[PDB]
Amino acid sequence: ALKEYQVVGRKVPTEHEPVPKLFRMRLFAPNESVAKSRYWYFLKMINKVKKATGEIVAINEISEPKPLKAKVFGIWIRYDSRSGTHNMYKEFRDTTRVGAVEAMYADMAARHRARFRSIRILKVVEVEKKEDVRRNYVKQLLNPHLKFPLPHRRTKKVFAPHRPSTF
Amino acid sequence: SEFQKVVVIDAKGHLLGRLASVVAKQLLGGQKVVVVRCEELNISGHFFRNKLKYLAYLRKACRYNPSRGAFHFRAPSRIFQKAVRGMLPHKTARGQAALEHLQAVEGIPPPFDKQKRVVVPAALRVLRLKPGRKYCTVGRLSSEVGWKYNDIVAKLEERRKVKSAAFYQAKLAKQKKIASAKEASPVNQKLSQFGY
Amino acid sequence: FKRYVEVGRVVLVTKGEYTGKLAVIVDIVDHKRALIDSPCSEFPRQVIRYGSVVLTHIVMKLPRGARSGIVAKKWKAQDVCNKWASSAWAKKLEAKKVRSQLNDFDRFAVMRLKKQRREQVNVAV
Amino acid sequence: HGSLGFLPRKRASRQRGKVKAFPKDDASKPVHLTAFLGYKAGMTHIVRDLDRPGSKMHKREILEAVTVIETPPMVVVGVVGYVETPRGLRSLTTVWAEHLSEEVKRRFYKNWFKSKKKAF
Amino acid sequence: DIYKDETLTIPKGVTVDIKARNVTVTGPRGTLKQNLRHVDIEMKKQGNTIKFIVWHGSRKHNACIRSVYSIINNMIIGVTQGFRYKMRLVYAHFPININLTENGTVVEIRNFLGERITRVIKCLPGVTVSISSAVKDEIILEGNSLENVSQSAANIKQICNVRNKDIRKFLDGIYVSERGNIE
Amino acid sequence: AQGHRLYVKAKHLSFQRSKHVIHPGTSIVKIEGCDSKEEAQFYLGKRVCYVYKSSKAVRGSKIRVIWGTIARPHGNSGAVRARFVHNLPAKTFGSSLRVMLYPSNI
RNA sequence: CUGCCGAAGUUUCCGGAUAGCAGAAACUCAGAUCAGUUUUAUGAGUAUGUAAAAUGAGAGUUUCUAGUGGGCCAUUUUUGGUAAGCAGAACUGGCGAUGCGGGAUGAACCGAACGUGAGGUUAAGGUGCCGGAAUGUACGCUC
RNA sequence: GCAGAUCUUGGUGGAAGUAGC
RNA sequence: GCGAAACCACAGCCUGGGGGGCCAGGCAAAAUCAGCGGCAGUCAAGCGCGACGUUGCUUUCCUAUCAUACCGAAGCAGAAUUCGGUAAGCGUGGGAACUGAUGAAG
RNA sequence: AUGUAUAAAAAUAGAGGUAGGCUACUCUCCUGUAUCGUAGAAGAUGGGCGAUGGUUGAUGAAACGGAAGUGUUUUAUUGACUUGUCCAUGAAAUUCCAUCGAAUCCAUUGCAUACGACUUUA
């Protein structure tokens, strides 16, 4: 599973710097020991505050306020390739930001075989307007007159007596 | 949930490598399996898919007294019997005693026409295969490699169906009498409250 | 004849903790997930997938994404319950739920029942 | 040793020529026979005209090397019947005639003159 | 996508039936039966039309959707209007013999470049060919199934196919010029 | 013979084993109708046997018996892991046992 | 016959040595006497060595006495190198003395170091059959 | 105190009723 | 009829993989006998070089067909010829216990 | 082996049945956790009420069933078993689970041939 964590932190204050700045991140992590490890990863590449200098101040979970409402998420990904160069924008349709990034990882694990550390997610925004959705298939599950038969049907205990209906 | 002393598995619509693995365990389990209509088994992949996978097996013979090489059997029954021969430890005393519990025949001989024909719901083609896929039929395949008995069995099986169809209407007319007699017994409708 | 996945389609949860409860679909979110609810309050609103549910033929008129009370309001007016029970599908599945609460002596009393029933083979010869 | 179709070189089993294949026929044709039995008298030679157009001896007289075969009238004594099976061609019933000569009754026996001659 | 639909209006033909997974297309000229196993596609009837639908699939199956739409339409053209094609022969020195037999099914062709080879062109089932009388060296072949009709004349085009000579100087031969409906 | 059979039909499956090391002191038993390792908690503790028929007759009959009980569930398919007073012979793979319903707790 | 301890397989000089590793007694000290270790401090141009904190553990002295200066690999620098390999110097380990689960069988791979047994639980690796264990669940791929 | 030294002495085998006279 | 001796870890089927034995396979019936292009220069895809370009001289097996079968292309009227393709089946560029004869037995 | 119970077929982007004259309408499927039989001192000995039914045995059979007919159906006749329903006597101290015809040798033959065999005759 996944659990989105709000993380903020700073460095140790010195006499030269009495008040360090505070930096907020909204990232995803299956537990909290990897959040406060990924947090020092992003902040080291951007703010150059090393792990031997900074400290962690607050970790909290962000449960989705409306998990019962369908939504569509536009997903900004910086992907670290074998050449280490990919900015990616991808849309997913589901209910929860926790659930989207799981599907984001899964698709990204198939077509582009991305690992854990090979991905640094950049920004996640609940895209709302229908004219901004830039994908054909996501658009088609959003027309009022949608319909389809069931796919992947299959309706122990081997040796069935009669033929399955499969209808 | 079956521990019959003998089971008859009608094989039309099944896959080869999945039925041969279901059967191979039930042989070692102690049962006595008969696989009828072995000629109408299916294999994933199009017609030429296993065709060169078996025409390659014909190119493989010993190079000492070539009447001692591999015996490439052409019958649809022995195609599947081969499939249940590598699945079993047929070099031990428990393998060659299991193999004589399996009787794999084509068509339906009369000793198994008049018995129940169970199917395997874990090896069927309409389940395990994506719709609109390429599949080849073994008995339609092995005819093109030497099994010269296609036109007889397709003729023979057609006669059995209409005879079995005639058997069915008499059986269907039988329970229509008891369909009336079931509700005619008044005790059914006021004492159905035990679920029945 | 072919049944489909609509808005407001009545379904039946076949694999889950609420196995066998009549629920109605609300909003289709994907090709594998959906929005589903039932007026029975023991069934909370939630996202069932299609691999662990079975469609039902009965359909019901409802706009998109109604709240639970309005689902119950439309359920009570268009009486899906006891419209499902009219079918022969419900007769077996409900009788499956009675023939499994049968104790030993009652499953012995059905022996008497079918012994009072077997000699009724007196028919028009 | 180059005609591998006739290899391996081992002796035959039946002293009598065994027919393996039989000609394809139809139900529209009248009933007729295929096989027979004869005996090797010996080789001889003949002379005969040649009514063959297009040959180098068209309408000429050419020697031909030939073979006379001693063929008696042939005694039918019953039938066998085949049904067609997925396992090949099985024989269903063997129906013989009423009476047999001692000659064919010698076929079933190894010592006909010693034994009780009680066949059939 | 999740749907791919294309519907053609059914004409006054006798049958637009697709029951039992077979194209039993019967019209005013006659009845035609064909196997419906090109692809697992949704043949749905709606009044005076038959709708072809490919729901929740990819392009590999979706590309075949228009083929059955054309194939049924091709069958509709044969059921309603039929097909009538005229093939034109070319003779320069040795005229090519042509004899229609078995109601025009067995085409006894000979004297192609004066050759003694007996060219027997057996027509496809359901097509009748005849030597057109209006224009010399013209053969008129008509039928309901255009696919069997078109392949037969192409086979006829492959029957007296020139070989072992220069195609420029040796130019007279069998050709097809008119390909149209019977109505 | 339908007014009898107060046991449950089973089949001795195999010894306990790894790929190369087999442990004939504890067996594997497949009970009929037990198709989950949570539905095998009902047959935990029952006294199973293995009845057969020898040629030479002792004490007025010929049928001999090897008793034993059931200790653990085994896997995700409703097999169990039994334990017999004499270890079952290795030539009884795929035989039939009886899972007697006692000591019954239901 | 059984039990206990148990190496080096490289030096340093000149086959002989000394040291080392393993050992036996005598005799030291319960201490800061140590430690294939990490801190903090001083310096030194992230690394370098030096001293007194953490952490563990009882340390030390000689005397007299066997075996041992083979190598096979794996580790990273590395200069000379080129069609292409490679050649060589140094570090670290294994194996030599070591059986066992996997890796289909293999010493150089993955786990793990062993009295005799019972019961449980795992590593590596696996759960369609051979083969003990999900034809499990989920999502995307492929003709 | 033996399993071994192309070990010493003694006894006996397979090759074989073969090679062969 | 007489009658050795050499020799003797135990041995005896093949394929592939680390040999007769190991692993995975093919299989497997007694008991016997007789044969056996480079250099220099200009560019410039793109990430100081840079591609395609441009300028200077110098027994059997295997197809990769040698004919036969079949076609494609060619200033191929025809003959004859050239090129290309399928094609190693048979002919006229390369590789290197086995077959007989008895035999018991469900 | 402790019931040794169960025979349409085809399809799955479908199937079977329901009027009517080739159809329209309606119904059914979507597991067999179904159907089928099941008590008796090892299935006791009697009596009643309801029924012409069920059950199996001895046959006399007849129709069938050939892809291995390893079997099915209609049964006359005879008989037991009749729990169909309702009442009467018995069970036990196993007093806490153990359960004559052929063939061959010898003979004969030559189509065969190293020995064997094969082929003739006897």
Swiss-Prot record, chain A:
GO terms for biological process: cytoplasmic translation. Component of the ribosome, a large ribonucleoprotein complex responsible for the synthesis of proteins in the cell. The small ribosomal subunit (SSU) binds messenger RNAs (mRNAs) and translates the encoded message by selecting cognate aminoacyl-transfer RNA (tRNA) molecules. The large subunit (LSU) contains the ribosomal catalytic site termed the peptidyl transferase center (PTC), which catalyzes the formation of peptide bonds, thereby polymerizing the amino acids delivered by tRNAs into a polypeptide chain. It comes from the Eukaryota. Disulfide bonds: none annotated. Component of the large ribosomal subunit (LSU). Mature yeast ribosomes consist of a small (40S) and a large (60S) subunit. The 40S small subunit contains 1 molecule of ribosomal RNA (18S rRNA) and at least 33 different proteins. The large 60S subunit contains 3 rRNA molecules (25S, 5.8S and 5S rRNA) and at least 46 different proteins. eL20 forms multiple interactions with RNA and proteins in the central protuberance, connecting components of core functional centers that are located far apart. Belongs to the eukaryotic ribosomal protein eL20 family. The keyword Ribosomal protein applies. InterPro entries: Ribosomal_eL20 (IPR028877), Ribosomal_eL20_dom (IPR023573), Ribosomal_eL20_eukaryotes (IPR021138). It holds the Pfam family Ribosomal_L18A. SUPFAM superfamilies: RplX-like. It is found in: Cytoplasm. The keyword Transferase does not apply. Gene3D superfamilies: 3.10.20.10.
UniProtKB/Swiss-Prot annotation, chain B:
HAMAP family: Ribosomal_uL13 (MF_01366). This is Large ribosomal subunit protein uL13B. PANTHER family: LARGE RIBOSOMAL SUBUNIT PROTEIN UL13, RIBOSOMAL PROTEIN L13. There are 3 genes for uL13 in S.pombe. Component of the large ribosomal subunit (LSU). Mature yeast ribosomes consist of a small (40S) and a large (60S) subunit. The 40S small subunit contains 1 molecule of ribosomal RNA (18S rRNA) and at least 33 different proteins. The large 60S subunit contains 3 rRNA molecules (25S, 5.8S and 5S rRNA) and at least 46 different proteins. It holds the Pfam family Ribosomal_L13. NCBIfam families: L13_A_E (TIGR01077). Belongs to the universal ribosomal protein uL13 family. InterPro entries: Ribosomal_uL13, Ribosomal_uL13_CS, Ribosomal_uL13_euk/arc, Ribosomal_uL13_sf. It comes from the Eukaryota. One of its GO terms (molecular function) is mRNA binding. One of its GO terms (cellular component) is ribosome. The modification Phosphoserine is found at S192.
Curated annotation (Swiss-Prot), chain C:
It is found in: Cytoplasm; Nucleus. Keywords: Cytoplasm, Nucleus, Ribonucleoprotein, Ribosomal protein. SUPFAM superfamilies: Translation proteins SH3-like domain. The keyword Nucleotide-binding does not apply. One of its GO terms (molecular function) is RNA binding. Gene3D superfamilies: 2.30.30.30, 6.10.250.2270. It holds the Pfam family KOW. One of its GO terms (cellular component) is cytosolic large ribosomal subunit. Its main location: cytoplasm. The keyword Ion transport does not apply. One of its GO terms (biological process) is cytoplasmic translation. Belongs to the eukaryotic ribosomal protein eL14 family. Component of the large ribosomal subunit (LSU). Mature yeast ribosomes consist of a small (40S) and a large (60S) subunit. The 40S small subunit contains 1 molecule of ribosomal RNA (18S rRNA) and at least 33 different proteins. The large 60S subunit contains 3 rRNA molecules (25S, 5.8S and 5S rRNA) and at least 46 different proteins. Component of the ribosome, a large ribonucleoprotein complex responsible for the synthesis of proteins in the cell. The small ribosomal subunit (SSU) binds messenger RNAs (mRNAs) and translates the encoded message by selecting cognate aminoacyl-transfer RNA (tRNA) molecules. The large subunit (LSU) contains the ribosomal catalytic site termed the peptidyl transferase center (PTC), which catalyzes the formation of peptide bonds, thereby polymerizing the amino acids delivered by tRNAs into a polypeptide chain. This is Large ribosomal subunit protein eL14. It comes from Schizosaccharomyces pombe (strain 972 / ATCC 24843).
Curated annotation (Swiss-Prot), chain D:
The modification Phosphoserine is found at S3, S55. Residues 1-24 are annotated as: Disordered. It comes from the Eukaryota. It is found in: Cytoplasm. Residues 8-21 have a biased composition (Basic residues). There are 2 genes for uL3 in S.pombe. Component of the ribosome, a large ribonucleoprotein complex responsible for the synthesis of proteins in the cell. The small ribosomal subunit (SSU) binds messenger RNAs (mRNAs) and translates the encoded message by selecting cognate aminoacyl-transfer RNA (tRNA) molecules. The large subunit (LSU) contains the ribosomal catalytic site termed the peptidyl transferase center (PTC), which catalyzes the formation of peptide bonds, thereby polymerizing the amino acids delivered by tRNAs into a polypeptide chain. Component of the large ribosomal subunit (LSU). Mature yeast ribosomes consist of a small (40S) and a large (60S) subunit. The 40S small subunit contains 1 molecule of ribosomal RNA (18S rRNA) and at least 33 different proteins. The large 60S subunit contains 3 rRNA molecules (25S, 5.8S and 5S rRNA) and at least 46 different proteins. uL3 forms together with ES39L one of the contact sites for the signal recognition particle that targets ribosomes to the endoplasmic reticulum membrane. Belongs to the universal ribosomal protein uL3 family. This is Large ribosomal subunit protein uL3A. It comes from Schizosaccharomyces pombe (strain 972 / ATCC 24843). The gene is rpl301. The chain holds residues 11 to 130 of 388 of the full protein.
